[PDB]
C-alpha cells in the first residue's frame with residue numbers, strides 16, 4: 289500500500305513531507321522526513337499495521353517506543369514523537385547523516401587505536417545514561433551506533449531493550465553479540481551490554497567480529513564455549529580490557545563506570561573530535 293507524500297498526525301498536528309528513502313530494517317522502512325512548517329529534518333521509521341496484525345508483535349514496538357520516548361541524551365537518538373494513520377505506524381527520530389559505525393567498519397576494516405578510543409568513549413557514555421536510568425539495550429551493534437555530520441556516536445534501535453523494575457532483577461525472556469548467559473537461559477542483566485561493547489571494541493580494533501563464522505549455529509557454540517583470541521598484534525593494555533569485557537562470568541565484566549577510567553582510554557592519544565574523512569581513510 290502507498291505511503292503518503294505528506295505525513296500528518298491527530299496529535300502534534302504537524303505535517304511531515306516524506307523525502308528520500310534511507311533504507312530498511314526488518315519490517316521497518318526509513319525515509320528522510322522534513323517538517324513542513326519548520327523545515328527541520330528527521331528520520332522517520334515507517335511500519336505497516338499489516339506487519340503488526342498480531343497483538344504480540346504490536347507490543348514489542350510499543351515497549352520500544354515507551355522506553356525510547358523517556359530518553360534524552362547527546363549519545364542516544366533523540367526521540368521526537370510518534371503517531372499512526374490507518375495503514376502505517378510511524379516513529380519520528382533524530383537524523384544521522386553519516387549512516388552507522390558498521391558502514392564505517394566495513395569500509396575501513398581495522399581502525400586506528402585513537403579512533404576506537406573516541407568511538408568507544410562516546411558509546412560507553414550513552415550506555416552509562418542507559419544504565420543510570422535502569423535500561424538495558426541488549427542488541428548493541430555497529431548498526432545501532434549512529435553517526436551524524438559531527439561524527440558523534442548516537443545509540444539507536446531499542447527493539448530488544450528492556451527497563452529493570454526492581455533492585456536485583458534477573459531477566460529470562462527475549463540480537464548480534466549475545467552473551468553466554470543469554471544463551472544458557474541462566475538469566476541476564478546489565479552486564480550483557482558490556483559484552484556487546486567488548487565485542488564492538490574488538491571488531492573495531494581488529495577488523496573482524498570476534499565470533500565471526502560463516503554458519504549461524506557455529507557462532508552460538510563459539511560464544512557458549514568462550515572461543516575467541518585477540519591476535520598478538522594488539523596492544524596488551526587494549527587486549528586486557530577486551531578480555532575483561534568479554535569474561536565468561538558476568539559478575540566480573542567491568543561496570544559501565546569502570547570502563548572510562550580503564551588504562552586503555554587514559555594511556556594513549558584520545559582525540560575529542562574526528563573528521564568525516566575517517567569514514568573512508570585513516571586520520572593523519
Ligand SMILES: COc1cc(C(=O)NC2CCN(C)CC2)ccc1Nc1cc2c(cn1)c(C)nn2-c1cc(Cl)cc(-c2ccccc2C(N)=O)c1
Nearest residue numbers: 310311312313316318331365381382383384385386387431
Ligand atoms: C542521511 O543519512 C543516511 C544515509 C543512508 C544511506 O546511505 N542510504 C543509502 C542506502 C542504500 N540505498 C541504495 C541508497 C541510500 C542511510 C541512513 C541515513 N541516515 C539515518 C538513518 C536512520 C536514522 C537516522 N539517520 C534513524 C534514526 N534510523 N535510521 C535507520 C533505521 C533503520 Cl531500521 C534502517 C536504516 C537503513 C537505511 C539504509 C540502509 C540500511 C539501514 C539499516 N538497516 O540500518 C536507517
